[PDB]
């Protein structure tokens, strides 16, 4: 009864830690773009978030599928074997809710850079 309750709270903590990990991956693509005064695609032309290598697992590792990261990603509405940054951010269920009406890209501009505004929008969910 008590040791079972402990293990549910570890599973909740594992899932949150995974969600934060995905936001970290997204946020580091966004900073890579900002650094190279570059744009970022977040649709199917952008990165695939269902990729073992992003979270420490090698490509064919069978325990990838048992990971709390894959658990989160593969349970979303938007999952289809692959998962774009927009699919993840707009997908449910996850504890940061949803982001609707994001464009498929945020291109580098010289004034009010849309990459910068996206960085801020994404950063206000890791909070």
């Amino acid at each position, epitope marked *: 009864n008590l040791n079972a309750a402990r293990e549910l709270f570890l599973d909740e903590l594992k899932a949150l830690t995974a969600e934060l990990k995905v936001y970290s991956v997204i946020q580091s693509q966004i900073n890579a773009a900002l650094s190279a*005064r*570059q*744009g970022i695609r977040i*649709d199917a*032309g952008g990165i695939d978030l269902v990729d073992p290598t992003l979270y420490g697992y090698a490509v064919g590792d069978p325990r990838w599928k048992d990971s709390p990261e894959y658990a989160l990603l593969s349970n979303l509405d938007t999952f289809s074997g692959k998962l774009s940054i927009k699919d993840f951010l707009s997908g449910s269920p996850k504890q940061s809710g949803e982001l609707k009406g994001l*464009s498929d*890209e945020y*291109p580098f501009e*010289k004034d009010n850079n849309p990459v910068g505004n996206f960085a801020t929008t994404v950063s206000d969910r890791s909070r």
Partner: antibody, heavy 123, light 108 residues
Framework: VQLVESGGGLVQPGGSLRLSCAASGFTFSSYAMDWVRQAPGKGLEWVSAITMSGITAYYTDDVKGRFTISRDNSKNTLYLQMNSLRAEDTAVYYC?????????????????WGQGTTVTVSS | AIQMTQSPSSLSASVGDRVTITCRASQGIRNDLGWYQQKPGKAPKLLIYSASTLQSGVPSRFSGSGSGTDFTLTISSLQPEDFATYYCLQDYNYPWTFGQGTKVEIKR
């Protein structure tokens, strides 16, 4: 490197034209693209730009809600759909490739231009 | 918004002279300003970008200068090939906007 425009001609006020620009001898999908126009005797007017992906478009004020820029990267082709045309749209329309600073999407100008295609709007 | 005002609208000079065209922005545009050359019935050609960087192939007599709102194209020793119209372009804000042009005519 080469850009060849086509699709210009004669049209009446309120009518429609589709301009095409055929790119060759460079990786079309890696560069942003523009339309620039020049009315007879007047100077250059930037009309529209589009990102390498073809997803985000930008427009000059005279043209907003009338023209639509687009591209097909599998065809190496840039388009300009021109609706609600009027006499003042009469001009040579140039297709132009944008260039970025090395390793960036930091746009600095148009280093390759087409020869232009003429559009004439009149009753 | 951003309006570019070149001057003079036109200008006369001889082979060998030192020519100077000015372009003024209605607002700050950093160094995000290019210069283009056009000749009659021909496509424009980029000469200078980022206010002062020479496009490769453009000869050294051309040179660019300025920051913020006031900029300057300069041909140190004008040549027969340089008689043409010159336009400035800001790309700091969308819509990008050209100057109204500056014709360089042969003097006599």
């Amino acid at each position: 490197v080469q850009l060849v425009e086509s699709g210009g001609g004669l049209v009446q006020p309120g009518g429609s034209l589709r301009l095409s620009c055929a790119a060759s001898g460079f990786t079309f999908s890696s560069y942003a693209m523009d339309w620039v126009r020049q009315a007879p005797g007047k100077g250059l007017e930037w009309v529209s730009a589009i990102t390498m992906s073809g997803i985000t478009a930008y427009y000059t004020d005279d043209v907003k809600g009338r023209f639509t820029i687009s591209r097909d990267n599998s065809k190496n082709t840039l388009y300009l759909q021109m609706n609600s045309l009027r006499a003042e749209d009469t001009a040579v329309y140039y297709c132009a490739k944008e260039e970025f600073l090395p390793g960036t999407h930091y746009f600095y100008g148009m280093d390759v231009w087409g020869q232009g295609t003429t559009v004439t709007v009149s009753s | 918004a951003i309006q570019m005002t070149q001057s003079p609208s036109s200008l006369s000079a001889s082979v060998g002279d030192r020519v100077t065209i000015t372009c003024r922005a209605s607002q700050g545009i950093r160094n995000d300003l290019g210069w283009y050359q056009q000749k009659p019935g021909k496509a424009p050609k980029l000469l200078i970008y980022s206010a002062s960087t020479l496009q490769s192939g453009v000869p050294s007599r051309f040179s660019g200068s300025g920051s913020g709102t006031d900029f300057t194209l300069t041909i140190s020793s004008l040549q027969p090939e340089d008689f043409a119209t010159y336009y400035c372009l800001q790309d700091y804000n969308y819509p990008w906007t050209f100057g109204q042009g500056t014709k360089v005519e042969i003097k006599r």
